[PDB]
């Protein structure tokens, strides 16, 4: 806190509570007793525990009929109207689309649909697998996610 | 039919002005005007102007007969205190409150 280290008044004789710094956290405008510093909130997750959790989540996404596996999922041109149309036909709104290699067109189409996310198999996080209503994996992607988790 | 007049931020502590207001609370306006006229207090001057204004308000705004008016409600609220430094002996300071009051008078035929 900005200020001098001058004792505000003498130790004895004034009839006031003894004071040492105008920056005392007891004082208005004083320091914060245990002032925050920037923190790293990152935790270590064991590799095996991370992979464990992915296997548990995917296994649940099958049991609750949320992992809708297809063979080929793309659009013709990079147009949001096309993917929106494809998703209303396939009959889902909120969905995570895991494809083998990330097709530029499907990436761009999805980008402006807030309920829709489009990732490559390398890019599956556990929160997204749980957050989305339905997960659409391409057969190609399931092979990679299998190979990836063993 | 009630009519109101306030003097807000009147220079005078409520305590001082309340001594005068207690004299005319419930009186006929004529009876009260007289009482105030022969009350040797600064506050009597203050309260007579607000009672005069209330009567005027009740004649001009509402079609009320001055002969029928009584002082129904009168009260004085503490106003903002103006704070001043008064120098005392040995270089010590006191803080003087110049106490203001809000004077409200309600006249009515009831």
């Amino acid at each position: 806190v900005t200020g001098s280290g001058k004792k505000p008044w003498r130790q004895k004789g004034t009839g006031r509570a003894r004071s040492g710094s105008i920056k005392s956290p007891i004082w208005r405008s004083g320091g914060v007793t245990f002032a925050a510093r920037p923190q790293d909130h990152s935790q270590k997750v064991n590799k095996k525990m991370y992979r464990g959790a992915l296997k548990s989540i995917l296994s649940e996404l099958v049991r609750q009929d949320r992992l809708i596996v297809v063979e080929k999922f793309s659009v013709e041109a990079p147009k949001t109207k096309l993917l929106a149309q494809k998703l209303k036909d396939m009959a889902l709104e909120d969905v995570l689309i895991i494809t083998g290699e990330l097709d530029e067109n499907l990436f761009l189409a999805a980008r402006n649909l807030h309920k829709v996310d489009v990732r490559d198999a390398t890019g599956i996080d556990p929160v997204s697998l749980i957050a989305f209503d339905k997960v659409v994996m391409t057969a190609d992607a399931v092979k990679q996610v299998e190979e990836m988790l063993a | 039919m009630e009519t109101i007049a306030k003097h807000r931020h009147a220079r005078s502590s409520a305590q001082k002005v309340r001594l005068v207001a207690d004299l005319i609370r419930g009186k006929k306006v004529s009876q009260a005007l007289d009482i105030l006229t022969y009350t040797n207090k600064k506050a009597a001057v203050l309260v007579k102007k607000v009672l005069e204004s209330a009567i005027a308000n009740a004649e001009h705004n509402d079609g009320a007969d001055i002969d029928d008016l009584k002082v129904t409600k009168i009260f004085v609220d503490e106003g903002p205190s103006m704070k001043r430094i008064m120098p005392r002996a040995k270089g010590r300071a006191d803080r003087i409150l110049k106490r203001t009051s809000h004077i409200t008078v309600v006249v009515s035929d009831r």
């Binding site: 008044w9 003498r10 004034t14 009839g15 006031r16 | 010590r92």
Partner: peptide
Amino acid sequence: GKPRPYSPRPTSHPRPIRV
């Protein structure tokens, strides 16, 4: 709140000496 206290001013009487 409280004003900053005064530096020592002159005293009318000595403190009685218990000693």
